[PDB]
Structure 1
Amino acid sequence: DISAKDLRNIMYDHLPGFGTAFHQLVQVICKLGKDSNSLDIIHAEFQASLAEGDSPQCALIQITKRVPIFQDAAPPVIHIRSRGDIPRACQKSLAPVPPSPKIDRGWVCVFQLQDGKTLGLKI
């Protein structure tokens, strides 16, 4: 049995850089995974994807397409003060938020700014 913190660190162990769209997706996947008691199936698929030769980014996308809790799941909204509060490595990954964003379509999270503006983090 793996904890949410331990699984997040395993995933971070593989990812290049820091504050990337993929780091955020790790946090999203571990939160929904913990809350749905899906951490072990997530862990097992992540390990098999890597063994099969997938990039760790692609292992994470495969989890969102395959693990039942991500079926139809919408991204969380993260309240922040201003756009400068979004990690640098996320700054070229932001796009207008559609009506009904889904994580398994690549909408990782939505930033909502203090002025009301929303910016969708997109892969």
Structure 2
Amino acid sequence: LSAKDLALLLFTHLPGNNTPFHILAQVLSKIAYKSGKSGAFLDAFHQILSEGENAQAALTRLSRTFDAFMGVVPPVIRVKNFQTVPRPCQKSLRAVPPNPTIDKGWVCVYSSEQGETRALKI
């Protein structure tokens, strides 16, 4: 079960496109895989769906509680500028705080060519 395979499974549960939950699904799948915890992550995700919570809620809770993401610095996504950040995410862009981690709702750091940064907050 690869990072891409996990991301595609999660995508089948998410409405629309270019949403913060899509960025989060891709970030979490990559970290889950690299830590050797892809299967455990997917099982946890399915358990939360079984409780009647939607995938958006399941991904939010797992980002906050699943051990693979505890104290993990968000990944950098290179962009031309903060205008080429997917439109539905632009609302959620914030200044990068001192010690950003996935478990505090810091999904990624957008890094512009001019060398500026914003963080995606859920």
Give the TM bin, normalised by the shorter chain.
over 0.9
Give the letter aligned to residue 110 of structure 1. Answer: V
Give the equivalent residue in structure 2 for 1:108.
107
Structure-to-structure mapping, 1:69-80, within 5 angstroms:
69-80=68-79
Q: 1:33 and 2:32 equivalent?
A: yes
User: Which secondary structure does the structure 2 equivalent of 1:27 belong to?
Assistant: helix
> Structure 2 stretches of 5 or more lacking a match?
none
In 1: Cα distance, 2:60 partner to 2:82 partner: 25
Q: CA RMSD in A?
A: 1.0
Matched with 1:91 is 90
Corresponding residue of 2:12: 13
Offset of residue 117 of structure 1: 1.3
Aligned residues: 122
- Tell me if 1:121 matches 2:115: no
Q: Which runs of 5+ in 1 are unaligned?
A: none
For residues 69 and 3 of structure 2, what CA distance do their matches in structure 1 show?
16
For residues 5-58 of structure 1, the C-alpha deviation after alignment (integer angstroms, 9 at most, x for no partner) is 221111101111101111001111011011011001100011111111112111
Equivalent pairs: percent with the same residue?
43
